[PDB]
């Protein structure tokens, strides 16, 4: 894997799915948000204020989340692919409601037979 | 899907995770640096800082205070995918900050020199 860092075609596919994910967040398109998370009990998301274990818990969280005050400005993005089937996506952002905090979002992506999926995610806000 | 938690692979990664946790408590920076992937792509979103590239992470390790190190691990999920990739996610607590619960996420890759962390993210939140 270490011999195949950021193969152009792989990096392009993952970047596309990442943009898809970010677009679905802004429109609260829960169908796409759920589509992009790996459907497995192992999948997990450490959110800004909650820890969710399993796809079912993540999907359930998305159903009960309010689409209000969701906007976020991405400031930095690093997408790295390893071989043909694995990737990480790491971003910094600012959320408009907490202008004094810098946001971090990490995702690990895996290529499944149904396409790229997030297997684990972690979001946090800090003051620098 | 594609070979989830193969016993031998899951055992190797769990061993390296235990190695990492032991090196944190003894502030064994040699082992801490050994376990992070030596690449400019490697990154660590720390509890209080964002570091890009192995050199920035190694530099941070040389200057860090080892004092408030100890922590109770409360949940661990280690998941391996095929033979060469893994994630490790833990929740932890400290008696020194009873109001904060910790999260630590890592993505691991098998290199020719062994398993390495390619990305990590640590954060503390209120209960
Ligand atoms: O607020 C959070 O927990 C993170 C977030 O913006 C939506 C996501 O990336 O799932
Ligand atoms: O104290 C913690 O759990 C987070 C941390 O920075 C140790 C590490 O770098 O793994």
* C-beta atoms of B2 and A86 within 8 A: no
Residue showing tokens 């993005």 = A77
The neighbour count for residue A55, using CB atoms within 10 Å, is: 20
**CATH architecture observed for domain B1-127:** Roll (3.10)
Resolution of the model in angstroms:
2.3
Phi-psi region of A48 (alpha: psi -120 to 50; beta: other; left: phi over 0): alpha
Phi/psi of residue B91, nearest 5 degrees = -115, 140
Q: How far is the CA of B47 from the centre of ligand 1 (A)?
A: 17
**Nearest protein CA to atom 6 of ligand 2, as residue:** B46
Q: How far is the CA of A31 from the centre of ligand 2 (A)?
A: 35
Task: Give B121's contacts in chain A (Cβ within 8 Å).
Answer: 46, 90, 104, 106, 122, 124
For β-strands A86-95 and A44-46, DSSP reports them as: unpaired
B93 touches chain A (CB under 8 A): no
DSSP assigned state of A27: T
Buried b (16+ CB within 10 A) or exposed e, A58-96: bbeebeeeeeeeeebeeeeeebbbbbebbbbbbbbbbbe
Question: Where are the domains positioned within chain B?
Answer: 1-127
**What is the Cα–Cα distance from A17 to B26, expressed in whole angstroms?**
41
Tell me the two tokens of residue A48: 């800004």
**CATH architecture observed for domain A1-128:** Roll (3.10)
Phi/psi of residue A7, nearest 5 degrees = -60, 130
B48, B87, B125 ranked by CB distance to A119: nearest: B87
């Amino acid at each position: 894997l270490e011999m195949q860092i950021n193969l152009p075609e792989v990096h392009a596919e993952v970047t596309a799915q990442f943009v898809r994910y970010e677009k679905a967040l802004t429109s609260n398109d829960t169908a796409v948000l759920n589509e992009l998370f790996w459907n497995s009990p192992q999948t997990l998301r450490y959110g800004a204020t909650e820890n969710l274990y399993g796809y079912e818990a993540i999907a359930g969280f998305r159903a009960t989340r309010s689409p209000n005050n969701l906007e976020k400005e991405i400031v930095r993005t690093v997408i790295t692919t390893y071989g043909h089937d694995f990737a990480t996506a790491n971003i910094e952002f600012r959320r408009l409601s907490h202008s004094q905090l810098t946001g971090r979002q990490s995702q690990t992506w895996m290529r499944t037979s149904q396409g790229w999926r997030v297997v684990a995610a972690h979001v946090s806000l800090i003051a620098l």
